[PDB]
């Protein structure tokens, strides 16, 4: 197959931020990681000062600015998720501004077991060592004599294989790691010192101590404090060997305090982030001994207010504070002294759009002018929320929960959306906030004598589950159905099914209970948004969690558990069992094309199915046998079918004499997105290449694939390998290398998918650059001009 | 959370390639059965079952009908098509097979004095190597595909480099007058491997010391099988329970026992299962397949994990596969049963029997 | 680039066993 790809929206979810003197010795620099993109910021007292932006062949894993003795700025040492570890310094001659490349390398080991708690990159205050946590019972240590021409990075054993958290203390003669790890009894925080000569760990300046059962996190408290800080569920330590400080904030009971950030340069206070998007400050007190060192004495936690969900916070100046959030909106925040009068010392300044997690979304023509617009359920929690995208312009419709599935009903004027929200079993589940499905215009609870034939307990995080009809004009809320207890809505579809003139709203849903490895009831609810009423038209059981839902030619297609099955619509408004289909672990994903149908296997790839009109049944027209777990799937055309596995990869398979070889689907596309696809659909969003499907992933990334002809495959091909000669990559990674299909199984290079960015790149570089690119090229001796406009017919598909 | 809707729930939110490892992991700690099937297509006992490294891909089996049968097992599940029979047999019982770091070629020995090395992608025999006993174990070089142990009947077990074949001079890394059961590489570290002698137990031996073995556990053992990051060794005892060791302890970290376990009248192998090796499975002679779960906390563990049944005959061979947490067993019967987790097609049981 | 970053292979199992087999010698 021959496929093309391009990002319309680049990833918006912030995965890391650092603060640092980069760019100039004098200025101060925020360094934002958004999955792929690198982005520089000056701070300046008028805000955050865009100075750079830089693709990345890999996603970023680990970000940290160092600088080691003589040197004048801070240098970058980033670690992709690929292994690919890379020193980078900011250099800007004149009015050139580009990275180079102080050091570069793969770290990857060819025998190791990913650790569980992921990947860790830190390195030590002196700048003597990177100490990096990829695997269990390993820890690489890249030395940083810079008076050297190799950096000979070595293993060094680790007698506790899960590590939960690392750090490097501060104030050490010779550079001392101290680590939270649990083994049996329990977590313990422990300390080694690295000895590069004989690579291996000694004994810690100070021994052992238990720390709480669910501590999760270590800063290294800078001098005079020395020392570590411990901070887990319930309780705040610090250890500096024969002090030991705790206390047990009962604010910090309510949430799991995931992001830290320092504020003062000595220590004195931090900012903590949780869960739940309030903001803490740790202040640490100090005591000066007569004529001696200060040291600690007490801790202290204070509430600093509400932001959003944060993945990092960094202090920038004057009290400003970056909130860099996955599931919200990214924030500048102000620090007050004085509180307003809800007692909030928090005040926002500034706010960065982040579509991610991009869970569902549609395609619809609202305005009805040909031009269509995407309507995707972004966020989680009260983050969670509705992006109107068109040609790009965002417009943002608050939920204030989480939003699972959209679909729009023409005939209603309106959306359908699956949304969920957390409740405490505050003694039945009370509430945590006001959101979408409280808010209702008017709102229905369903009463199902169904499963009235599973414990519970005061305090537990339950999921409740709501059917949302939103007006499309005003986007109110007009409707909001609550589902029964323990049931999640899983599917919505919006059709007519058999001679039923009406257009419904069905939605699958599942009986969940956490002690059961999968549902073994659900339902599929049939119901009509009639004068402003949305009545249960229909109710089906079924045996099982109804993970997909599709109208296939009048009838309804369902995922239950492993079967897939079709029912019809009769003439007395009631579902009647067609067909099923029993040779899937599990149908999570269902398309449709005519009378084909792809089916997606939680880790069974793709198949193949076709019904029969003259048969009434199923028939298994093919399937793919590499196994690979898939998180979205799509027909391409009557031939081709796009998957997403969840290792960030992208495969093509078509349906290829014998009747074995004609029952295969063989996998003729393979690509390394470097994204974790949730959702596709199909349609464009502007009105060479043939068809239009945009896909929508976990970082805020829209992109859009189409399929090529064998002549322009080929061009754009020699384009790409011509390009790579000369676009200078940043950490000097490979594109090849980078676009490699890639899986602890296997790896393999990239075949039927043309990287669209690196095209599009072509246009942006300079003129020399665009006719040495084209240089021999094929025919008429193609120039620039020609490729030129390729290009830009290329770009106008979105 | 248990259920899956919450693991999808969770990887559709934050997209990390680590939560299906965990979410196997607690799917498997939570069953109390598995699936079953058959596979059908050796016209004898099957000796020897082997899972292709790096995914499991493929399925090597040989037994008492000679043949080395190459089973895709996607497309067998599914009985799509037939078992591939590589070109060139034994004219023996089949007691071991192996594959190569990247699965391209097969060894294949055992009671024909006799290791053929075949060639996977076009099923054709590439190279002989004579023995003077029958061969029990092969153990392939984890760094080099061209250097393999086998343990013969004789009591000796030799380090063959395929690469200088013609002039068969194989290095004779152990000579006991007992007969050797088996031998493995190191996974890890291949210049160390372990041995399970009949009449020396397990000892750990060094590629450059020929005749001194580094350690000796514990004497009988008859199958001896390192954990994936090599530093534990699991052996099976010739009337005792299972028993684990640290590599370098020298002493029984564990022993394994469960009412109806029983391993004297055929010569079994075992496994690890689970993607950290958590799991110690064998089969028994009454005809069940026990697993037992290692201890977290350091010594006989009563009680298995799991007492799977099914198999009509003694169960003597166990695999586990990790990227599809999948266990194949063969036996004195010609059918090989597999147990999943998960639904398979015309499969039996369930996960909570 | 001015430098490099090579893995070096090192023994971590026989450095770990020679270790624990020359501590056992009291």
Same mark, same amino acid.
């Given at each position: ?798 | ?23 196997? =992991? ?5 069953? =109390? ?278 198999? =009509? ?41 | ?26």
């Amino acid at each position: 197959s021959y496929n093309y790809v391009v990002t319309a929206q680049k990833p918006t979810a912030v995965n890391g931020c650092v603060t640092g003197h980069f760019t100039s010795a004098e200025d101060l620099n925020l360094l934002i990681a958004k999955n792929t993109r690198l982005e520089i910021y000056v701070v300046t007292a008028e805000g955050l000062r865009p100075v750079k932006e830089v693709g990345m062949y890999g996603k970023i894993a680990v970000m940290e600015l160092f600088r080691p003795k003589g040197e004048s700025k801070d240098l970058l040492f980033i670690l992709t998720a690929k292994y690919n570890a890379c020193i980078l310094e900011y250099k800007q001659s004149g009015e050139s501004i580009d990275i180079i490349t102080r050091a570069h390398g793969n770290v990857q080991d060819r025998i190791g077991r990913p650790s569980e708690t992921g990947i860790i990159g830190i390195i030590d205050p002196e700048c003597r060592m990177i100490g990096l946590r990829l695997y269990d019972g390993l820890f690489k240590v890249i030395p940083l004599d810079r008076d050297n021409k190799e950096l000979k990075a070595f293993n060094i054993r680790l007698e506790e294989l899960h590590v939960i958290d690392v750090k490097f203390l501060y104030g050490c003669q010779a550079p001392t790691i101290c680590f939270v790890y649990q083994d049996p009894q329990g977590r313990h925080v422990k300390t080694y010192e690295v000895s590069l000569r004989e690579k291996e760990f000694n004994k810690g300046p100070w021994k052992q101590e238990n720390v709480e059962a669910e501590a999760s996190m270590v800063i290294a408290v800078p001098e005079p404090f020395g020392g570590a800080i411990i901070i887990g569920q319930e309780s705040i330590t610090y250890h500096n060997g024969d002090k030991y400080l705790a206390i047990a904030p009962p604010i910090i009971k309510q949430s799991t305090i995931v992001c830290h950030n320092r504020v003062d340069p000595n220590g004195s206070r931090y900012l903590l982030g949780d869960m739940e998007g309030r903001l803490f400050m740790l202040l640490l007190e100090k005591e000066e001994q007569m004529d001696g060192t200060v040291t600690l004495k007490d801790l202290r936690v204070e509430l600093l207010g509400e932001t959003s969900i944060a993945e990092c916070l960094t202090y920038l100046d004057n009290g400003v504070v970056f909130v860099g959030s996955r599931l919200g909106d990214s924030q500048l925040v102000k620090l007050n002294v004085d509180s307003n009068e809800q007692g909030s010392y928090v005040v926002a300044m500034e706010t960065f759009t982040n579509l991610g997690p991009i869970v569902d979304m549609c395609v619809v023509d609202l305005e009805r002018q040909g031009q269509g617009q995407l309507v995707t359920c972004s966020g989680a929690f009260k983050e969670g929320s509705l992006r109107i995208i068109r040609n790009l312009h965002i417009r943002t419709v608050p939920l204030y929960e989480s939003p699972r599935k959209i679909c729009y009903q023409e005939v209603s004027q309106c959306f359908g959306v699956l949304s969920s929200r957390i409740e405490v079993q505050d003694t039945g589940t009370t509430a945590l906030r006001p959101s979408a499905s409280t808010q209702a215009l008017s709102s229905s609870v369903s009463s199902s004598k169904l499963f009235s034939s599973h414990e519970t307990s005061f305090g537990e995080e339950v999921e409740v589950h709501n059917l949302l009809i939103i007006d499309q004009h005003t986007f109110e809320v007009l409707h909001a159905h609550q589902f029964l207890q323990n049931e999640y809505a899983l599917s919505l579809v919006s059709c007519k099914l058999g001679k039923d003139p009406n257009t419904y709203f069905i939605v699958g849903t599942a009986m969940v209970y956490p002690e059961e490895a999968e549902p073994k009831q659900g339902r599929i609810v049939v119901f009509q948004y009639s004068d402003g009423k949305l009545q249960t038209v229909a109710e089906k059981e079924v045996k099982g969690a109804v993970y997909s839902m599709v109208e296939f030619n009048g009838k309804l297609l369902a995922s239950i558990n492993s079967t897939v099955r079709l029912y019809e619509w009769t003439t007395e408004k009631e579902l009647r069992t067609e067909c099923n289909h029993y040779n899937n672990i599990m149908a999570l994903y269902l398309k449709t094309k005519g009378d084909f149908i792809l089916v997606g296997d939680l880790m069974r790839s793709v198949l193949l199915l076709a019904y029969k009109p003259m048969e009434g049944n199923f028939e298994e027209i093919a399937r793919d046998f590499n196994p690979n777990w898939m998180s979205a799937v799509e027909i391409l055309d009557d031939d081709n079918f796009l998957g997403a596995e969840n290792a960030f990869n992208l495969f093509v398979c078509q349906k290829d004499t014998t009747d074995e070889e004609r029952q295969h689907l063989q996998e003729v596309g393979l690509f390394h997105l470097g994204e974790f696809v949730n959702v596709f659909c199909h349609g464009s969003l502007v009105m060479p290449t043939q068809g239009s499907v945009l896909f929508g992933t976990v970082n805020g990334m829209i992109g859009l694939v189409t399929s090529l002809s064998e002549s322009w495959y080929n061009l754009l091909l020699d384009m790409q390998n011509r390009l790579n000669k000369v676009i200078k990559s940043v950490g000097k990674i490979e594109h090849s290398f980078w676009r490699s299909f890639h899986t602890e199984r296997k790896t393999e290079p990239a075949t039927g998918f043309i990287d669209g960015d690196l095209i599009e790149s072509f246009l942006d570089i300079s003129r020399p650059k665009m006719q040495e690119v084209v240089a021999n090229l094929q025919k008429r001796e193609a120039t620039a001009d020609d490729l030129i406009k390729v290009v830009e017919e290329l770009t106008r598909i979105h | 959370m248990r259920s899956v809707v919450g693991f999808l729930s969770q990887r559709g939110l934050h997209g990390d390639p680590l939560l299906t490892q965990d979410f196997q =992991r607690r799917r498997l700690r939570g069953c =109390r059965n598995l699936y079953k099937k058959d596979l059908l297509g050796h016209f004898g006992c099957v000796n020897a079952i082997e899972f292709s490294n790096n995914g499991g891909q493929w399925l090597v089996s040989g037994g008492d009908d000679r043949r080395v049968l190459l089973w895709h097992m996607e497309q067998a599940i599914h009985s799509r098509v037939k078992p591939i029979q590589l070109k060139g047999e034994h004219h023996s019982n089949i007691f071991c097979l192996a594959f190569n770091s990247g699965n391209t070629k097969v060894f294949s020995g055992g009671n024909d004095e006799q290791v053929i090395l075949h060639d996977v992608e076009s099923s054709e025999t590439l190279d002989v190597f004579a023995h003077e006993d029958a061969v029990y174990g092969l153990s392939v070089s984890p760094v080099n595909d061209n250097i393999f142990a086998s343990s013969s009947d004789d009591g000796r077990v030799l380090i063959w480099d395929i690469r200088e074949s013609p002039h068969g001079e194989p290095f004779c890394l152990a000579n006991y007058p007992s007969a050797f059961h088996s031998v493995m590489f190191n996974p890890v570290e291949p210049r160390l491997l372990a041995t399970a002698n009949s009449k020396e137990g397990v000892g750990l031996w060094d590629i450059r010391k020929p005749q001194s073995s580094l350690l000796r556990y514990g004497q009988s053992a008859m199958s001896v099988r390192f954990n994936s990051n090599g530093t534990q060794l699991l052996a099976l005892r010739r009337r005792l329970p299972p028993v684990l060791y640290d590599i370098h302890s020298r002493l029984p970290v564990f022993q394994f026992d469960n009412q109806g376990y029983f391993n004297s009248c055929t010569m079994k192998s075992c496994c690890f299962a689970g993607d950290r090796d958590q799991y110690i499975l064998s089969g028994s002679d009454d005809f069940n397949l026990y697993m037992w779960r290692i201890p977290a906390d350091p010594r006989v563990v009563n009680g298995a994990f799991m007492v799977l049944k099914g198999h =009509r005959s003694i169960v003597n061979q166990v695999r586990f596969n990790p990227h599809t947490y999948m266990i194949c067993s063969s036996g004195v019967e010609k059918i090989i049963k597999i147990w999943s987790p998960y639904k398979q097609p015309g499969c039996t049981g369930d996960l909570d029997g | 680039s001015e430098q490099i970053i090579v893995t070096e292979k090192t023994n971590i199992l026989l450095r770990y066993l020679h270790q624990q087999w020359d501590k056992k010698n009291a």
